[PDB]
Design a protein around this nucleic acid. Sequence first.
RNA 1: GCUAAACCUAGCCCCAAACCCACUCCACCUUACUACCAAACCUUAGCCAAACCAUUUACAUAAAGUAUAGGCGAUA
RNA 2: GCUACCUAAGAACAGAUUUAUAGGUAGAGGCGACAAACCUA
RNA 3: CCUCCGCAUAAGCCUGCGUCAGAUCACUGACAAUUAACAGCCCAAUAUCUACAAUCAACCAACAAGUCAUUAUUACCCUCACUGUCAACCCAACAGGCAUGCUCAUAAGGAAAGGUUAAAAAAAGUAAAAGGAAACAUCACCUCUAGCAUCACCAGUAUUAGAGGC
Lengths: 117, 176, 387, 43, 101, 220, 322
Amino acid sequence: ADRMSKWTSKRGPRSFRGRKGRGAKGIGFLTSGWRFVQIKEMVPEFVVPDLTGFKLKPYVSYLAPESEETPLTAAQLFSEAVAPAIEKDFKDNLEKYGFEPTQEGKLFQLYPRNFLR
Amino acid sequence: GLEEFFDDPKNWGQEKVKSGAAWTCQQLRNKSNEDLHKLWYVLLKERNMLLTLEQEAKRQRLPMPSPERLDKVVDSMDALDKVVQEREDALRLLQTGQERARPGAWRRDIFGRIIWHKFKQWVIPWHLNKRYNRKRFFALPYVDHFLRLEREKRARIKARKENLERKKAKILLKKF
Amino acid sequence: YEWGVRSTRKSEPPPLDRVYEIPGLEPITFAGKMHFVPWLARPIFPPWDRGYKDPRFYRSPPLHEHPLYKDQACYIFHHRCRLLEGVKQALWLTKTKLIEGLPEKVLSLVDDPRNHIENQDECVLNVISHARLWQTTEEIPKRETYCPVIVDNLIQLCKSQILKHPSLARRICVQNSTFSATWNRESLLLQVRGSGGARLSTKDPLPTIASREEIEATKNHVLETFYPISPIIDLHECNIYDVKNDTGFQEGYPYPYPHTLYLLDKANLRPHRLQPDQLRAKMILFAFGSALAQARLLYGNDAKVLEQPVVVQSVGTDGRVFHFLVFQLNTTDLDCNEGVKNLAWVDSDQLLYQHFWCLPVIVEPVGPVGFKPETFRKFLALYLHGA
Amino acid sequence: GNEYQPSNIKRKNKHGWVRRLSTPAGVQVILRRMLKGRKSLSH
Amino acid sequence: ARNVVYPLYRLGGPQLRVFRTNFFIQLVRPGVAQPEDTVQFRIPMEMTRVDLRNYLEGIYNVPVAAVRTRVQHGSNKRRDHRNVRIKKPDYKVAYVQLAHG
Amino acid sequence: ANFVSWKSRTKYTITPVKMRKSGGRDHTGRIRVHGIGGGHKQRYRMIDFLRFRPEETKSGPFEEKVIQVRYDPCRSADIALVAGGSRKRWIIATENMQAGDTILNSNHIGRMAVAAREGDAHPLGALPVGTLINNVESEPGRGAQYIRAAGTCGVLLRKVNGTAIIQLPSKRQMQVLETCVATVGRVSNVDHNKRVIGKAGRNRWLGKRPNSLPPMKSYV
Amino acid sequence: MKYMVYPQTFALNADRWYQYFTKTVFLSGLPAALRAVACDCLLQEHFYLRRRRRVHRYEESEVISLPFLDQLVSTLVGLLSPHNPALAAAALDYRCPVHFYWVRGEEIIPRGHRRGRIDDLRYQIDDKPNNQIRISKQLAEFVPLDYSVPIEIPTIKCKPDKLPLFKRQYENHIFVGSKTADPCCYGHTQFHLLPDKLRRERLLRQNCADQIEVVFRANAIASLFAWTGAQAMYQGFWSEADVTRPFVSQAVITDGKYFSFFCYQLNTLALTTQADQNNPRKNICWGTQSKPLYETIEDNDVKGFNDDVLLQIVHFLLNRPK
RNA sequence: GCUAAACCUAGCCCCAAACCCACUCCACCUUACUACCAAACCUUAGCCAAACCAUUUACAUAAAGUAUAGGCGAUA
RNA sequence: GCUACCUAAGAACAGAUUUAUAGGUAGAGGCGACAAACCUA
RNA sequence: CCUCCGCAUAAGCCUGCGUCAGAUCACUGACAAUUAACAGCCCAAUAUCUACAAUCAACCAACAAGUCAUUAUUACCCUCACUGUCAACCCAACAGGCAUGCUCAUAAGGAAAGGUUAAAAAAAGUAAAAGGAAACAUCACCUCUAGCAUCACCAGUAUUAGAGGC
Ligand SMILES: [Mg+2]
Ligand SMILES: [Mg+2]
Ligand SMILES: [Mg+2]
Ligand SMILES: [Mg+2]
Ligand SMILES: [Mg+2]
Ligand SMILES: [Mg+2]
Ligand SMILES: [Mg+2]
Ligand SMILES: [Mg+2]
Ligand SMILES: [Mg+2]
Ligand SMILES: [Mg+2]
């Protein structure tokens, strides 16, 4: 006879506790003997680089000046990236410019996205 | 090296940690992607230091040495994330141009309202998906009176706010 | 009346509308959207396939496209194979003669009291207390765990009695034993694939039991078939078969000649177990199977009279009740129904005890009841039989 | 008297959302609560 | 790896790496007396135990050996001026017992 | 209200299976029959309605050997689970049908009557008019519906050209074709009516809670 | 309530905490055709048997190595039957557990309706080595009865929860592997096969470098105090009446890739707090480093027979009462 | 004297005009707030008023509350 | 989801017994050893 | 001096006499807790066996007629994830119930006397001479209807199914 709480872990009986969980992402699979096998394939993989020798400190000193908030406009960035290649090529078929027909073969595709955060 | 899980032991007890302002977004926007990874990891370390320090301050039931430092590091990390999202959005706009980064649609749900549903990456197909076919995303005529009633409630709040604002304006002009 | 109502069967398909029956125009079905819904025309999808190959849902290829599906189906004898007519069916299928009473060739070792363990009935009662009383943490265990443990105990007693003579010390006992073999009898092809207990093997085989005069006299022995029940019933219809012979052991195995086998039904229910005559026939059939397996391992599929008759023994245990036998085959022309055939000498109902009483009354003694160690003398003699 | 002897499995059965959404009158019930604007839109 | 859908993975997919993992962490002093070889933390609501091992190995390269998870439900007996049940921040806590003494 | 029907298997097998009772309750969930259902637990085995059912790769008559009439809760008379060839089938035991006897099912209708056994089943053309019969079918191959209770018996009152007429257990004339097969004699568990429960324990254990001439029929 | 001490334990540095739960002395050291027979068994369960089911490491020791050690122990008993006469009177139980109760621990339960009071912090240990040989004559003592030693056992640092454990209720079974009614009171030796989830390969996947040794020593100490308390109970002793003649035990623990031995001269059949004040006696559990016996896997036969393994097997299998 | 009183002003009221609501990331029809394997429309009814009860009966201005219909009894 | 009756599938000691759990019968009803009793003060 | 309880799991609730301070027979805010082997959470296809109860299971002795078994062939390699664990607890009157495993008073647990005085009327107990009362269901039986099948009756066939009477 109580309902206003959330539906977190503790609700009712054994299996009723058993199915749901908090906000994890699943890692393995359930096979015989009620034994879970978790592959290294589906696991999270957090490989950060080496931090030695990077001179950019975590905070920025207040002695530096201020600038203008230049949002990464798609046309502006596209012009800035494709200006020299198109300028040389027209002075000289967008595959030379790198236009992607489909991202079906790339590691980090965009539509759908397969990267992480 | 667990020694980084606490902050610098030298600054302990100094009542204030002399930290600079957060990195400006456009200023941070001029750094490389590898440099961006470096900045994010450094931000993670400093933020962890902040969380541990604040929780310990609660455990010691005392004030905080540098209260603005935690939120400042959070804000700088958020700005770096904004830059990362801007770059990924520029990539999505250039390469294919789809608007919402996840593929999805606008449709109607069993509550009868108009919404945008998100598709989910799943193996089996929509002609055999045992769960997705159970998703009753259809509405017969039995949603009419409730839908118009929802319109009615929306309009009631609308006229209420308008009347409140204009009458408050009338009293305000009466004050002059 | 055909069995089974249609109610819990599959749902009948509703009538597809004539919109799909349009001769020229493909209807605007539910394909573009994602709603198996009423507000449109029903999408009709073709047969798609899962391109990915994964363990989780990879279904078998059809069993007409299988790489090995012969027209001549194998009649199989497995560990669950309860024969129909009992040992008559076993004698029909394996083409073997039965002789009541044990064979005296090994039984002559049990005549002298020198081949006996000291306080043999006392050590037997000790095994009885270990099994029926002191097996597990429970107060009174069921025979399901006890009887196989009792077989293990008797096997250990036999292994420990080896100080008197090193001969059976040249023998080993291995578990997880699964042999398989084929035999063509009268017209039918049969395959026995059996996994059992106490694969008791050694280096050299034991000698023959009876003389070749009895082998010639086996021509007069006739298989009493059943009618109208043919003796091909109570097998497993292996419609997909694979022609081979399985010795149960790969190459490089020392001491691979079989001697004897031990079987029991570890069932929680007598209904879940083999019947006593049925278990005796099961032991006889598994004996013939391991014998034919050794014959194929030694000289292969030569359907004729073997130069040395292959012989092995086996015993079933009911927890207290045991039934032992020894079988000697010398011929392999199982398609032929005459001539020399296998022979069997058996001693059934060789019980360890009448029953077990775990608690007193008010009175009767506690422990094993109706114990007879002369059958235990016979079993211990069989443990050294042919060595 | 101890009549209310509730149980969570039967609770989410007889008062849940799937069952309350299985027949369209319950969908109307959901909508009625929605225009009533409660919080516990189901049980 | 919180607040995002991770990519769908098949039988033999690529190793789904990270770029800048957002799952920050907080390791506090123990409250009751505890053994020496373990340090615990108030990890956020998302990551796995092996994920905690990996995040520690990334940040500091610690010798993670054992990993522990307990779901402390926040309490729900404390009321606001509107007199309503307002549950606290619930938290799932973790512990990494570190190796090599 | 989604109770699936108890008879869920479609293939014949020698063993009984667990079936779900109704207790008089209909598939609309209310009791359609008063005082029905709820006895001691029993399982449902496939009872073969066709006495002579041809097997795989076979034709004509076939004999078989029985195992044991046990008291099967699925029937009122005794039971004859019998194996023949490679097929096992449980039929209703006759008045004189014991274990160890061989039972032959034949379908051939001879020129004259056939002196069959006590528990033998044959076509209507292979039987004398005025013979005690049991397990009477209604059509050729439909299955032995009529005259199947314990101790019941029926006499073939007349035989016409390709037709038989038999008095049913209610002394009602039933006229079927000669292409229908029936078993001779009376069914087992005789004098089951002559029995006294003594108390209400057996009647309540029989699946029961407390409570709330004809013209000649033809089939050819 | 009772704490639970699983034999094939998981925890790091667990030998010390299990030792404080055991209050034993932890010391290093010790107190023909066989090699061919052992290689034959290894080849039998490894190569000479055709596996119908494909060999899954989901049952790695569960499909091969347990039958391997079983064959080794049975054939070893058969071979050494000439050497030690008491082996004739010995039973060889296989894959059977034994149960006993440890009684040590005293602290008020922290928070609740049973506050402040002393509660008998019992614990129940029930476990199985792979195969146990049981002797009808009690073995002699390795060190003397109450043979003192220089070092002191490690002591607990905190409550019984901060190390990996749990406390449940289960029936207080105190069993030698059998009831009191069986004749074979003491034991001959024991043979333990490790669980798969703590594999040395899995330990290599783990960061725990040396603690496989801790694992072996701990499960051995558990089995040793187990069989010893079984001796004490079958000897009629109690915590109400301390046992005097030394509790003698011997055992082998294996994990397929290595082997190890252990022995026990247990002394404190009563280790409860009400008697722990008047407690000058102390028990000892001896064991040396684990070592590998079977080295590699060729196609036909194995090579590099670590002859110390079978020699120590005979050595622990040969001792007898006088 | 204490309890107490009293105080404006929150925002509601009707209208005028005008067409509105629905994507921080996420998840959300299984036990809704959990990342994953082989089915829809089918006439509203009824009282009330007849002094009880039954056919009948509702769920811009002007002609005109006239022509139509009423157990020709109440009205629409 | 109490209770009435039934199904599924467990439990205790001697039946027309009781009961842990799911599920089913909706008022113009079901259920009823029929008390013109029950089905949430 | 009490304890026919108590300890656990089950269900069910939801941190609810843990810690540091306030002052409300003398509750509020902040901080800390419960680190699994037990229990869930499962199980790659297509066919094919699965009559021989259980009661200590060996006899006797039955009826209410039995609560539990694979096998054949193909495909398949990588391992320890996630979630419950606390407590003086739950339903109701402003008398009671709670399924299951152990201890049958005990190792655990608990306090009916706020303080006094010793009135009647009442309530509970002890004691008292002398006398010793001054209808419904149902077995059995009878009657009636129905000659037969794929969602009840019924997977049944008039020694059957249903309805009435005593
Ligand atoms: Mg946990
Ligand atoms: Mg009126
Ligand atoms: Mg209910
Ligand atoms: Mg476990
Ligand atoms: Mg608890
Ligand atoms: Mg007390
Ligand atoms: Mg009091
Ligand atoms: Mg008083
Ligand atoms: Mg008197
Ligand atoms: Mg008197």
